[PDB]
RNA sequence: UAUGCCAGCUGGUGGAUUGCUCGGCUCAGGCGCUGAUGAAGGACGUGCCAAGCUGCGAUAAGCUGUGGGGAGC
RNA sequence: CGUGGAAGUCUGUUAGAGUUGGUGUCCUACAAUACCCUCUCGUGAUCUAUGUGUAGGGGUGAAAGGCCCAUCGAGUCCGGCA
RNA sequence: GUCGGGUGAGAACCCCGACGGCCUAAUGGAUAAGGGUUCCUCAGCACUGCUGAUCAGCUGAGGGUUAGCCGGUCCUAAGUC
RNA sequence: UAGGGAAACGUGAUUCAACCUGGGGCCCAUGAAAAGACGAGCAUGAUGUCCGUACCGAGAACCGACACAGGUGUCCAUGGCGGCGAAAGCCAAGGCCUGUCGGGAGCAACCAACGUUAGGGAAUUCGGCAAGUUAGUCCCGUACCUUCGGAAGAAGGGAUGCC
RNA sequence: CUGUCCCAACGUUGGGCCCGGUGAACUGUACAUUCCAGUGCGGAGUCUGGAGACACCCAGGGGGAAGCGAAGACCCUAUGGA
């Protein structure tokens, strides 16, 4: 499949989205992505 | 040191396609008794190994001649075709 | 010590299958570190990553059989598998035959030979296929 | 108003390309086009761009390849900032 | 052929994708239409007294 | 007496119960239009480190003025 | 006698399409229609990819009430509706 | 698959060699759709993997896709708006 | 006196996919369109932006809730022996040991797939279901019936290796 | 023509059995070692009378639990539906 540039920027952001929730937040907030998604198990949209 | 003779009669009792692997066991369980030694401590050089596969995985020499050495402080035995 | 990712390395570097590069079981540890393509490179210059040859089906003994064949031999009713028509195509044997019929009454005519009547009688006749082969014409000609 | 020149890209890649092929990498705005990221390049710069390739990384963002003359020196422009 | 799982095998068309207007995955790429606000269809939003119960 | 039955004891498992309420549900009073000066909504961005939410819009958790406020942020 | 090479033509696990029997295997499956062997068609009313059209008392149907997204003697969703 | 060896706290299944096999319209090569980062490197084993794992399509962090002349782009088809 | 190769760094031939160019035949079937190019020269210089480009493409990257024995289009149809063959069987190039749990018991009963069974030979069964028999090629030879096409590979008989 | 049969045998490969590791589901009012008779809503492991019965575990083929699976499609009925 022929990706456009606006699907690109879109599977960009899903991509960056799947990053871990960073180290300094568990210490600030004294204690989960929820927006984990896999490229097999889950689906994005289009 | 000496030189043994193999018996690889039992491995027709393991299916034919795989009596290569069994021969491999025996030799490994025959030394090890003849020779006062653990199965894990029983090394066999590439040669018994080339020797016992030579026609293929079913077709195993009935017989296989094999010189054997023994030494070390828990005690082992190197093993080789001949 | 993984050295999987430098097969496929030592593979595009002297250009053979994945299957068919050596690596020397002593150097396992200078392979470990080899990183790049130039460390690589490097590492077949010194021996230690070699290709294997590859093999080539021996033609020797179909050499021997297509001797037998062309003299003859082998060819016999418990050897053929195919059809008559299947071993020998029937329309490009007439070509075969047609085409040297029609060669031999053209160089009869320019030799003198023959006149544009008599060579005009045979060629129709050729064209009938009265004539089995080129020697069959020639016993037709001569008398 | 959109700048054209985000900020260098600096990865391994990039410095290969700088210390080989004198060339220097750069993250631009996705809406400049080869002629726009030559003419920003050669003005915060003062150098002569010879040649730009772009591609749209899966970053959302454009990545600029930037061609120096053999007059200028990459390695040297890279060091001053 | 069974309607179930081999005939699953040939679903790799692309209809439904991301509407330009209201951002859900129902804007039929081949109707031009999305399914869900009524993009290609109407200049107004596709709303329905059915989507909510009679008395809300 | 093994396998084992019934009740209990200590410890689990589980999350009922009791207590608690940043949420709801309902009633009442007030108020009440927005949009081509491009709305509402959506997309993508935006933080030193930033995934979610909130905010914001390339001037991007914010810029200016007046008033309040006050030693904190 | 040769030439010619016709054909909803023949043999064919060529590719490909189909699905007769085993009422085999499976039947908390590998699988909400699968596996194996056997069998049928295979230059034509042939097979096939992609694009495109026809919509629910309506389509489509070499007709079996077949098919219209595991849904059909009237699809699916939500509403009427408690 | 087997015998040796490598790394490792740990090795039947991670890697090397040898021997022994399997695939030939495919189990090889290039691709469409579709997927969407699954690609590469490094670090890992809590999750995932029909057992184990030092391995991985898994976890985390980095990196990676460069075109006047390959496609799109342009043209018109059934047909659609 | 590009590139590539450790080296040599060939020459002729046959059969010839691709590609080129012709002749014939068939249709109660007649086998796109448009943009564009040609027609219509040469120098020199400049410009040539924008979007895609990773990887999988499958018995683990797609659809089927799964790392599903299912389903899923195209090009490689000219690798060798074999043979009519893009058939079988075997083997290169390439790929793989991941159709991903192992160890042990001459390893019983029982089951799935399957081999061989004397004499008899369908007695089995609703029924030869299942299995088996036959088989490729050449030669000889071939009935009833027929819409004269066919029946027909009728049937039946012989042959078949190697040197 | 032949293991379809007389009439069955031996063998082969994968299971099956033992060990390591992984690890479900169906089903469950209770009690439950049953058997022969009887009785009972006339088809009882549980009632009555007798008989038998030391507990536990392994493998088996499935006699019984009118076994498990599905609020019977048959039939009738409903001032039911299509
Ligand atoms: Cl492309
Ligand atoms: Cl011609
Ligand atoms: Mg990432
Ligand atoms: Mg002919
Ligand atoms: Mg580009
Ligand atoms: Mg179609
Ligand atoms: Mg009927
Ligand atoms: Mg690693
Ligand atoms: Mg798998
Ligand atoms: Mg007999
Ligand atoms: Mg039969
Ligand atoms: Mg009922
Ligand atoms: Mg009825
Ligand atoms: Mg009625
Ligand atoms: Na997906
Ligand atoms: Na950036
Ligand atoms: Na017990
Ligand atoms: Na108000
Ligand atoms: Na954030
Ligand atoms: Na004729
Ligand atoms: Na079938
Ligand atoms: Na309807
Ligand atoms: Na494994
Ligand atoms: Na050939
Ligand atoms: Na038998
Ligand atoms: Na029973
Ligand atoms: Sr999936
Ligand atoms: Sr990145
Ligand atoms: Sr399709
Ligand atoms: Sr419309
Ligand atoms: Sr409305
Ligand atoms: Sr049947
Ligand atoms: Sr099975
Ligand atoms: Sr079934
Ligand atoms: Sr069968
Ligand atoms: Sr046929
Ligand atoms: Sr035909
Ligand atoms: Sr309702
Ligand atoms: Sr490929
Ligand atoms: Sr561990
Ligand atoms: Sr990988
Ligand atoms: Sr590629
Ligand atoms: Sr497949
Ligand atoms: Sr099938
Ligand atoms: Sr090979
Ligand atoms: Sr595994
Ligand atoms: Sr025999
Ligand atoms: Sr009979
Ligand atoms: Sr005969
Ligand atoms: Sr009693
Ligand atoms: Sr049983």
């Keep these: 499949g022929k990706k456009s540039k606006a699907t690109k920027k879109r599977l960009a952001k899903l991509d960056n989205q799947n990053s871990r929730v960073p180290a300094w937040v568990m210490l600030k907030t004294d204690r989960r992505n929820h927006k984990r998604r896999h490229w097999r198990r889950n689906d994005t949209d289009e | 040191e000496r030189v043994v003779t193999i018996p ?14 069994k021969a491999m066991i025996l030799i490994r369980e025959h030394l090890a008794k003849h020779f006062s030694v653990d199965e894990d401590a029983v090394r066999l050089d590439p040669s018994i190994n080339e020797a016992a596969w030579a026609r293929g995985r079913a077709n195993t020499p009935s017989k296989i001649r094999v010189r054997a050495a023994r030494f070390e402080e828990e005690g082992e035995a190197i093993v080789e075709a001949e | 010590t993984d050295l999987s990712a430098q097969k496929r390395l030592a593979a595009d570097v002297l250009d053979v299958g994945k299957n068919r590069v050596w690596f020397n079981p002593e150097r396992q540890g200078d392979i470990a ?7 690589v490179r490097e590492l077949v210059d010194e021996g230690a990553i070699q290709a294997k040859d590859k093999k080539g089906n021996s033609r020797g003994r179909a050499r021997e059989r297509q001797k037998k064949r062309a003299y003859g031999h082998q060819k016999g009713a418990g050897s053929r598998k195919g059809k008559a028509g299947a071993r020998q195509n029937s329309k490009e044997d007439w070509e075969s035959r047609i085409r040297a019929q029609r060669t031999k009454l053209r160089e009869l005519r320019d030799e003198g030979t023959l006149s544009s009547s008599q060579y005009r009688d045979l060629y129709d006749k050729a064209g009938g296929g009265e004539f089995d082969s080129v020697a069959d014409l020639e016993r037709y000609i001569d008398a | 108003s959109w700048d054209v020149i985000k900020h260098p890209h600096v990865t391994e890649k990039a410095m290969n390309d700088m210390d080989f092929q004198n060339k220097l990498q750069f993250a631009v705005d996705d809406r400049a086009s080869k002629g726009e990221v030559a003419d920003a390049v050669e003005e915060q710069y003062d150098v002569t761009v010879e ?7 899966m970053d ?22 | 052929t069974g309607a179930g799982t081999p005939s699953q095998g040939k679903k790799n068309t692309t209809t439904h994708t991301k509407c330009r207007r209201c951002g859900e995955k129902s ?30």
């Design chain 2, 8 to 21: 690889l009669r039992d491995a027709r009792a393991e299916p034919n396609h795989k009596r290569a692997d």
């Design chain 4, 51 to 57: 040649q730009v390739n772009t591609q749209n990384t």
């Design chain 4, 60 to 81: 959302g963002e454009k990545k600029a390849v930037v061609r120096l003359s053999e007059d200028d020196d990459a390695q040297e422009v890279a060091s001053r900032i």
């Design chain 3, 33 to 39: 570190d080899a990183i790049t393509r130039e460390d």
């Design chain 5, 27 to 56: 804007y039929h790429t081949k109707k031009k239409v999305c399914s869900s606000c009524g993009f290609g269809k109407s200049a107004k939003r596709r709303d329905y007294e059915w989507q909510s119960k009679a008395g809300e």
